[PDB]
Amino acid sequence: XXXXXXXXXXXXXXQRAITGASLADIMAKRNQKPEVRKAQREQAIRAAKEAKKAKQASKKTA
Amino acid sequence: ADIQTERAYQKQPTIFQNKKRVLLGETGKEKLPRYYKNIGLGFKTPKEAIEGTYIDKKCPFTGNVSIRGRILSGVVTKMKMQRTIVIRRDYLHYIRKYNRFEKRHKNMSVHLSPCFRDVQIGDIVTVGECRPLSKTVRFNVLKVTKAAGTK
Amino acid sequence: MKLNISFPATGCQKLIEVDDERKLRTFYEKRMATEVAADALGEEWKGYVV
Amino acid sequence: GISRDNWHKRRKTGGKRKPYHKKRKYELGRPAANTKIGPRRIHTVRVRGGNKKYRALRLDVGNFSWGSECCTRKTRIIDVVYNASNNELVRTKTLVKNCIVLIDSTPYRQWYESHYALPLGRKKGAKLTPEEEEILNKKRSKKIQKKYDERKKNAKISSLLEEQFQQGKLLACIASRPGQCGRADGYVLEGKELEFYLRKIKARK
RNA sequence: AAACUGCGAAUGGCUCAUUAAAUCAGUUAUGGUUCCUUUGGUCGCUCGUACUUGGAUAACUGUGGUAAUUCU
RNA sequence: UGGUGACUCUAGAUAACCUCGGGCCGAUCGCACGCCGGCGGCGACGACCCAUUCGAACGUCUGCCCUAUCAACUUUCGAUGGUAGUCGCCGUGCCUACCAUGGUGACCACGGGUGACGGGGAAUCAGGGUUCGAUUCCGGAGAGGGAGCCUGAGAAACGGCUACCACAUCCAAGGAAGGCAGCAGGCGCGCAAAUU
RNA sequence: UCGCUACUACCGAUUGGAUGGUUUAGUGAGGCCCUCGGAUCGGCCCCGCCGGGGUGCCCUGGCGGAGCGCUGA
Ligand SMILES: [Mg+2]
Ligand SMILES: [Mg+2]
Ligand SMILES: [Mg+2]
Ligand SMILES: [Mg+2]
Ligand SMILES: [Mg+2]
Ligand SMILES: [Mg+2]
Ligand SMILES: [Mg+2]
Ligand SMILES: [Mg+2]
Ligand SMILES: [Mg+2]
Ligand SMILES: [Mg+2]
Ligand SMILES: [Mg+2]
Ligand SMILES: [Mg+2]
Ligand SMILES: [Mg+2]
Ligand SMILES: [Mg+2]
Ligand SMILES: [Mg+2]
Ligand SMILES: [Mg+2]
Ligand SMILES: [Mg+2]
Ligand SMILES: [Mg+2]
Ligand SMILES: [Mg+2]
Ligand SMILES: [Mg+2]
Ligand SMILES: [Mg+2]
Ligand SMILES: [Mg+2]
Ligand SMILES: [Mg+2]
Ligand SMILES: [Mg+2]
């Protein structure tokens, strides 16, 4: 006799392997935990700090 | 009273009347201060404007217009329009071939502030140019000189 | 009638050609952007929602 | 579309002229924006030069100056009482410049009673509420009571205005043209004009 | 390369049908207005995730349709 | 405070206002690399608003060929003016509402005609004129005829669009696409005019 | 004057025909404006179940299931 209902449909983002990184690599970096990432970050940060003060000494040398 | 003819209230847009006062100053008198401006070319703004009670927005003195442009003169012929008159300017147009002039004339519709009055057909009126007031009216009456036979 | 069918999550397509009046019976009198399960479409489809 | 051009027209004498050019953009007229009282509705138009003209289809609030005591408050508009131009325009309640309009007394009476600490438009029944008595009767300090008392000589109001407050509705007039402007803003009718317009609207009956 | 964006396409070129205080010429005004650009001015004057924020779309990949297009 | 021949100018102070179809305040780019974990040089775009330039748009004064076998004309549907508005980028019967009854005309209005775009100019000339100026500069109009809009700083644009009329192209008959008064060139017209 | 031949314009029924220009009236494509309309496309909530964090709850995450909830385009 009438329609009172307005349907609400949902949008879902699935996962696909992106060319050059297969779904195993995406999930390998995604599921990586806070200890691993924090270690990598602080290590790269300190390597970069060393290279940078080395290049500051290489600025004052020239 | 008698100043307000029209449906709308008749004001002098740049003056604020309703400024409040003591009941000792309300008993003294109500004189709403005129706005009048001195028009520039050395026409002394008539006495009848600065004292006078009338309100006309398009008058050069008591209202909003600025007189800039040509300044012309003519003679009054027909006044049946309200706050405007028709004046005619005569002149001689030279025809080269014949080496002589022919007479010619043009009719101007021009607005006239209610301060000037007793302006009588056939007398000299000097007008000055304004921004367009109406369809045919681009001018404004700056000063009125009587005809040669005034008593 | 040809059907142009698309799997979003897989990211693929196929062009299918359907001549059956029933299979289209399910689709007639339908607006765009409405969900119909594909049943009459074939044996394989079944629980497939289109 | 609608051309506000001058060349469709008789001469000063009245001979019709044959138009030399077909209609030009800049001579365009737009449709009339009539403005009604309701919940706020506004449509931006892009005009010559690329500037925004703000057009008002429905208005509610407008702000107004109570000029005597020199204040201005943001008020709610109620009704169109009078229009010099057109009676038809009163009937449909249309807001144009210089039509005349009823507004809420409220924010004014509040300001006033805060400034002068005096009763305004209150019934002779005199019935009051706690906030009212604490604002009006209040408490003072010596320098304070002298200030307020010094202003009490000043504040007295035209009997007409006084009445208006008692009714809750003030008579005002709109100086801004909502049609192009986007706001209906204006001033309270005081004194001579107020008495005048009152005479016109009593004359409307 | 393409495609998005920005800008230009209102100039220039052609013709003389209309058009008789109209166009137009000299003359003046805009204190009655709009102005991309260019040139100079302004651009911590406001007292109330930032070592960087949100979503989408074109080219591109692909599946297509129509006799037909600078269609989609 | 400053300015004009003259402002209801510019600047100042007070009360408020501020559009969801929103105003300003840089979430941007490059090249050099240097200085005491911090500092910065040159540029590129942007940007509200002044001012300026190119203008544009409306007004002022004076000026046009023939015609009386056109003498009165305009005004219920704006003619002329008044008052308040609407619209517009603003001044204005531009448009509405309400009043007034005006305005033009033998100094030739109004109407008709023009093998009429207006000028700068050309031909011819003792002095005076007469005739011509579609045509390379300046201004106006128009893109088959009318009308109506998008976009934009700027068009009522036609090498944009939407109709109707007139024309005409393609078609698988469902539909689609048109605009040389740009250059060439073709047809027609014609006494009359060039190379795809 | 009459007569013969030729050539021009004129009156002339035919409500003669054709074209152009205005326009009264009726009809009225198409844009623009207003009032609606609301196909669809989102966002926020509502819960269920589970994972991490913070203290039965709170902050998140991961899905899902659903309401004439209320908002934007
Ligand atoms: Mg600008
Ligand atoms: Mg492009
Ligand atoms: Mg540029
Ligand atoms: Mg600049
Ligand atoms: Mg493709
Ligand atoms: Mg008027
Ligand atoms: Mg006016
Ligand atoms: Mg009327
Ligand atoms: Mg011609
Ligand atoms: Mg000529
Ligand atoms: Mg010429
Ligand atoms: Mg030529
Ligand atoms: Mg030219
Ligand atoms: Mg044109
Ligand atoms: Mg042609
Ligand atoms: Mg542009
Ligand atoms: Mg066109
Ligand atoms: Mg062409
Ligand atoms: Mg062109
Ligand atoms: Mg050609
Ligand atoms: Mg031949
Ligand atoms: Mg030849
Ligand atoms: Mg009709
Ligand atoms: Mg229609």
Short mmCIF file of C-alpha atoms in Angstrom, two decimals, chain B residues 33-133:
data_model
loop_
_atom_site.label_atom_id
_atom_site.label_comp_id
_atom_site.label_asym_id
_atom_site.label_seq_id
_atom_site.Cartn_x
_atom_site.Cartn_y
_atom_site.Cartn_z
CA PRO B 33 18.06 72.55 11.30
CA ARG B 34 18.19 72.97 7.50
CA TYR B 35 20.75 71.18 5.50
CA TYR B 36 21.84 73.64 2.86
CA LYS B 37 25.00 73.63 0.84
CA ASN B 38 26.84 76.38 -0.91
CA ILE B 39 26.87 75.67 -4.60
CA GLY B 40 30.27 76.42 -6.04
CA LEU B 41 30.40 78.85 -8.95
CA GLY B 42 29.68 81.87 -6.85
CA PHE B 43 25.91 81.86 -6.87
CA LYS B 44 24.98 82.86 -3.38
CA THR B 45 22.48 80.30 -2.22
CA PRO B 46 19.19 82.22 -1.96
CA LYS B 47 17.83 83.40 1.37
CA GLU B 48 14.65 81.54 0.67
CA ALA B 49 16.43 78.22 0.80
CA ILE B 50 18.35 78.48 4.06
CA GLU B 51 15.46 79.81 6.09
CA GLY B 52 12.69 78.18 4.07
CA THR B 53 10.53 75.24 5.01
CA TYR B 54 10.09 73.26 1.75
CA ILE B 55 11.65 69.94 0.85
CA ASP B 56 12.85 69.08 -2.62
CA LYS B 57 15.52 66.40 -3.06
CA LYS B 58 16.44 67.53 -6.53
CA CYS B 59 17.02 71.20 -5.63
CA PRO B 60 20.70 72.17 -5.95
CA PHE B 61 20.82 73.91 -2.55
CA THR B 62 18.68 72.03 -0.06
CA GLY B 63 18.99 68.58 -1.57
CA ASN B 64 21.29 66.10 -3.22
CA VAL B 65 22.70 67.05 -6.63
CA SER B 66 26.00 68.59 -7.71
CA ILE B 67 26.26 71.29 -10.32
CA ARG B 68 28.99 70.49 -12.74
CA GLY B 69 29.06 70.83 -16.46
CA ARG B 70 28.04 73.46 -18.90
CA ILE B 71 26.39 76.62 -17.56
CA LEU B 72 23.69 77.93 -19.91
CA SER B 73 21.08 80.64 -19.86
CA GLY B 74 17.61 80.92 -21.37
CA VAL B 75 14.19 82.49 -21.01
CA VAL B 76 11.16 80.99 -19.29
CA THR B 77 8.23 80.18 -21.48
CA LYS B 78 6.06 77.41 -20.13
CA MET B 79 5.60 76.48 -16.51
CA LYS B 80 2.82 74.05 -15.91
CA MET B 81 4.94 71.13 -14.70
CA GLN B 82 5.44 70.70 -10.94
CA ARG B 83 8.92 71.79 -9.94
CA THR B 84 10.05 72.24 -13.51
CA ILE B 85 9.78 74.71 -16.35
CA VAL B 86 10.44 74.86 -19.99
CA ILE B 87 12.92 77.44 -21.18
CA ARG B 88 13.98 78.22 -24.72
CA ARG B 89 17.40 79.15 -25.93
CA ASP B 90 17.75 81.05 -29.15
CA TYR B 91 20.83 81.44 -31.30
CA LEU B 92 22.02 82.01 -34.84
CA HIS B 93 23.18 79.12 -36.98
CA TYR B 94 25.65 80.18 -39.68
CA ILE B 95 25.14 78.75 -43.20
CA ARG B 96 28.44 78.90 -45.06
CA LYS B 97 27.11 79.08 -48.65
CA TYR B 98 24.99 82.16 -48.09
CA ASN B 99 27.28 83.82 -45.57
CA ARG B 100 24.42 84.51 -43.27
CA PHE B 101 22.77 83.20 -40.13
CA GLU B 102 19.33 81.68 -39.66
CA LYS B 103 17.50 81.80 -36.35
CA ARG B 104 17.09 78.67 -34.30
CA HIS B 105 15.96 77.55 -30.90
CA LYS B 106 15.99 74.64 -28.54
CA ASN B 107 13.68 73.77 -25.70
CA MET B 108 15.05 72.58 -22.44
CA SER B 109 13.12 71.08 -19.63
CA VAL B 110 14.79 72.14 -16.46
CA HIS B 111 14.08 71.68 -12.76
CA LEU B 112 13.33 74.58 -10.48
CA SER B 113 13.74 74.65 -6.69
CA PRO B 114 10.67 75.89 -4.80
CA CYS B 115 12.89 78.53 -3.15
CA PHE B 116 12.78 80.59 -6.34
CA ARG B 117 9.29 81.74 -6.92
CA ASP B 118 7.47 84.55 -8.67
CA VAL B 119 9.46 83.23 -11.60
CA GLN B 120 7.41 84.63 -14.39
CA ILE B 121 7.14 83.56 -17.97
CA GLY B 122 9.51 85.49 -20.20
CA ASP B 123 12.28 86.18 -17.70
CA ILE B 124 15.91 85.28 -17.76
CA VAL B 125 17.04 82.24 -15.96
CA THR B 126 20.55 81.00 -15.67
CA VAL B 127 20.91 77.27 -15.33
CA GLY B 128 23.75 74.88 -14.76
CA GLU B 129 24.10 71.28 -15.60
CA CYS B 130 23.37 68.38 -13.44
CA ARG B 131 23.27 64.60 -13.53
CA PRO B 132 20.12 63.37 -15.20
CA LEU B 133 17.05 64.11 -13.04
#
